[PDB]
Amino acid sequence: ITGTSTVGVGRGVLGDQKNINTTYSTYYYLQDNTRGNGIFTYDAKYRTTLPGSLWADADNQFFASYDAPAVDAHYYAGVTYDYYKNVHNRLSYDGNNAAIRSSVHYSQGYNNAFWNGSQMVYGDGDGQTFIPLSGGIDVVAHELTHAVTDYTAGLIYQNESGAINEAISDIFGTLVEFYANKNPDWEIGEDVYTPGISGDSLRSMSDPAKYGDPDHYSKRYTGTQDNGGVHINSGIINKAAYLISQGGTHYGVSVVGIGRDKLGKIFYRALTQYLTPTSNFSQLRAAAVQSATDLYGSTSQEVASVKQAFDAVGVK
Ligand SMILES: [Ca+2]
Ligand SMILES: [Ca+2]
Ligand SMILES: [Ca+2]
Ligand SMILES: [Ca+2]
Ligand SMILES: [Ru+3]
The missing domain is CATH 1.10.390.10 (Neutral Protease Domain 2)
Known part of the structure; x- marks a missing residue:
C-alpha cells in the first residue's frame, strides 16, 4: 500500500519484544519499506487461500497472541534479507530486490512452513508437534533460501x-x-x-x-x-x-x-x-x-x- 514508513513494536512467538517496520495509511500495515522493494506480511485467517489480507493493525502495537506469528514472519524475513545483502551482496531472493511476501495463520493446526514458488507460508502448528513456525529463525531462512535456490541453481x-x-x-x-x-x-x-x-x-x-x-x-x-x-x-x-x-x-x-x-x-x-x-x-x-x-x-x-x-x- 502507499503510505509513510513507521516503526511498530510487538512480541514474537517466543515472547520476545522486537521493533518492526510498518506502513501507515489509516491502519498500520506489516509492510517494511526499508528493505528492497518491500517486505509484506499477510493474514491467511486460518484458511488456505493465499496470500490473504495484508496485515492491518489499528495502533502499531503487536502484542496480542494472534499477532505473534506475524511479528516473527515479518522480522525474520528482514533478518534473512539482511544476511544475504550484507554477507553475499545479494539483493533479496532474486538478486533484484523482489518483494518478500509471507502469510501466517495458514490453515488450522498446520505443522509446516513452506515457500510456494511466490511467497512464504506459515502454519500455526497444532500446539503439540509445533508452535507457530515463523518463531524459528532457521525455519524462516530455510524456506526463503528455497526462493534463492529456485532463482539460481534450480x-x-x-x-x-x-x-x-x-x-x-x-x-x-x-x-x-x-x-x-x-x-x-x-x-x-x-x-x-x-x-x-x-x-x-x-x-x-x-x-x-x-x-x-x-x-x-x-x-x-x-x-x-x-x-x-x-x-x-x-x-x-x-x-x-x-x-x-x-x-x-x-x-x-x-x-x-x-x-x-x-x-x-x-x-x-x-x-x-x-x-x-x-x-x-x-x-x-x-x-x-x-x-x-x-x-x-x-x-x-x-x-x-x-x-x-x-x-x-x-x-x-
Ligand atoms: Ca495492535
Ligand atoms: Ca522441543
Ligand atoms: Ca537451529
Ligand atoms: Ca537455536
Ligand atoms: Ru524445505
Whole structure:
C-alpha cells in the first residue's frame, strides 16, 4: 500500500519484544519499506487461500497472541534479507530486490512452513508437534533460501538434487541463525518443535542420525517416499557441511574445520555459479571444490577440507 514508513513494536512467538517496520495509511500495515522493494506480511485467517489480507493493525502495537506469528514472519524475513545483502551482496531472493511476501495463520493446526514458488507460508502448528513456525529463525531462512535456490541453481526437488536443495536450505537457515546470534546451533527447528520436550529438533546437521537420517552415502534412502527422501538424504550433505565448518573425525576420516563464514562463501558460490537443476551429490562435491578453488586457491586448506568432508560422508 502507499503510505509513510513507521516503526511498530510487538512480541514474537517466543515472547520476545522486537521493533518492526510498518506502513501507515489509516491502519498500520506489516509492510517494511526499508528493505528492497518491500517486505509484506499477510493474514491467511486460518484458511488456505493465499496470500490473504495484508496485515492491518489499528495502533502499531503487536502484542496480542494472534499477532505473534506475524511479528516473527515479518522480522525474520528482514533478518534473512539482511544476511544475504550484507554477507553475499545479494539483493533479496532474486538478486533484484523482489518483494518478500509471507502469510501466517495458514490453515488450522498446520505443522509446516513452506515457500510456494511466490511467497512464504506459515502454519500455526497444532500446539503439540509445533508452535507457530515463523518463531524459528532457521525455519524462516530455510524456506526463503528455497526462493534463492529456485532463482539460481534450480535444483529439482526430487532424489539427490532435491536432497541438495533441502541441505542448502538447512545450511543457510543455520548460518542466518548464527548471524542473528540468538541461541545458534546446528539443529533445525528447535525453537518451534515440540514445546513439551526440550533438547530435540526436526533434524540435526552435526549428527543427522540422532533422528534416523543418513550421515553417509552408503546409508542413503533409495525409495520413493518424500520425493525420493529429500528431507532424509539431506543428512549426508548437512553432515558434510557441518564437517567443513566445524571439523571432526567421521567414520575414521578427519576433517579440518574452516569455520562458518567460509562454509557460507563456498556454498553460496557453488549454489550461484556451478550447481544446475539436475546436480547430484558427486556434482555438488565438484562444485564445492571448484568454488573453494576460486576463493582460496587450489592448494588451500579450504579446498583440502572440502575434499576431506565429502570423503567422510562417502561422496566422491
Ligand atoms: Ca495492535
Ligand atoms: Ca537455536
Ligand atoms: Ca537451529
Ligand atoms: Ca522441543
Ligand atoms: Ru524445505
